[PDB]
Design a protein around this ligand. Structure first.
Ligand SMILES: CC1(COc2ccc3c(c2)ncn3-c2ccc3cccc(N4CCC(N)CC4)c3n2)COC1
Length: 263
């Protein structure tokens, strides 16, 4: 499959919308990641162009760079070319091979930087999870998939829609009654779920039945698996990130000063 200078190869991810394919670029003799979208499949335009707008203003070592967009109005397919991050996702969940505490800290430091940057740029990511965190050749993670991200005006996003990955959704986004909830806190909750996954290899709240998953997220006290044992300070940080109450939940400026993070 040829598309200008790019030859499209195998699928390397799904994501919130469309698919991601490896692409060889004949002009500079290296590889890219190409997100491929069907206009007809998205109908059943503007949300895509808002994602492009977001991506265009972003430039940080812990966020995946958009290189260009190929958008022929006579074709159904829209192509978004990104930098390729060689090693791919930090982990698949579940896994029996979780990260050590030291590896988790290292990636979690990158995650903090990335998220701090996004929030500064007035973007709520909305889909933070291990499979969206790509390990670069330098060993550092980069945040990917802005498919469900929101841009806001003023100091925080005021949100009412429920999107993202169900196991990573904050309890305040799961009410039966339409509610309004703050966006920065949602990303903190998902960072917490992610950190739990990093060290345990499974999510904190799990069920095959979507309604029971929601029920657990809202009403089941957080439990730690029997293995591996983790340090008291990491338990503390995870507990404060997974605070069901978005008002008392730890904020990113506090996370950066947490003893687990800074030791
Ligand atoms: C083939 C291997 C390499 O994997 C990969 C995967 C995605 C890779 C990658 C290397 N460099 C970049 N990206 C991207 C780029 C843009 C994306 C825009 C939207 C969504 C994506 N993703 C992120 C990962 C998720 N699991 C699926 C959706 C995106 N990914 C796996 O080990 C080698």
């Amino acid at each position: 499959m040829q598309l200008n200078q790019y030859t499209l190869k195998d699928e390397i991810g799904k994501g919130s919308y469309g698919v991601v394919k490896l692409a060889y670029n004949e002009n500079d003799n290296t590889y890219y990641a190409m997100k491929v979208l069907s206009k007809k499949k998205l109908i059943r335009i503007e949300q895509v162009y808002q994602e492009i707008a977001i991506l265009k203003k972003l430039d940080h070592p812990n966020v995946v760079k958009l290189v260009e967009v190929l958008d022929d109005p006579n074709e159904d397919h829209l192509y978004m070319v990104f930098e390729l991050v060689n090693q791919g996702p930090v982990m698949e969940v579940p896994t029996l091979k979780p990260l050590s505490e030291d590896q988790a800290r290292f990636y979690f430091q990158d995650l903090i930087k990335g998220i701090e940057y996004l929030h500064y740029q007035k973007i709520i990511h909305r889909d933070i999870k291990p499979s969206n965190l790509l390990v670069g050749e330098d060993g550092h993670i980069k945040i990917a998939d802005f498919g469900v991200s929101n841009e806001f005006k003023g100091s925080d996003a005021l949100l009412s829609n429920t999107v993202g990955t169900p196991a990573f959704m904050a309890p305040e986004s799961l009410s039966e009654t339409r509610k309004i909830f703050s966006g920065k806190a949602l990303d903190v909750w998902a960072m917490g779920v992610t950190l739990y996954c990093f060290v345990f290899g499974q999510c904190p709240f799990m069920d095959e039945r979507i309604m029971c998953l929601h029920s657990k997220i809202k009403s089941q006290a957080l439990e730690f698996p029997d293995q591996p044992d983790i340090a008291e300070d990491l338990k503390d940080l995870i507990t404060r990130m997974l605070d069901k109450n978005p008002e008392s939940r730890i904020v990113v400026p506090e996370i950066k000063l947490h003893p687990w993070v800074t030791r």
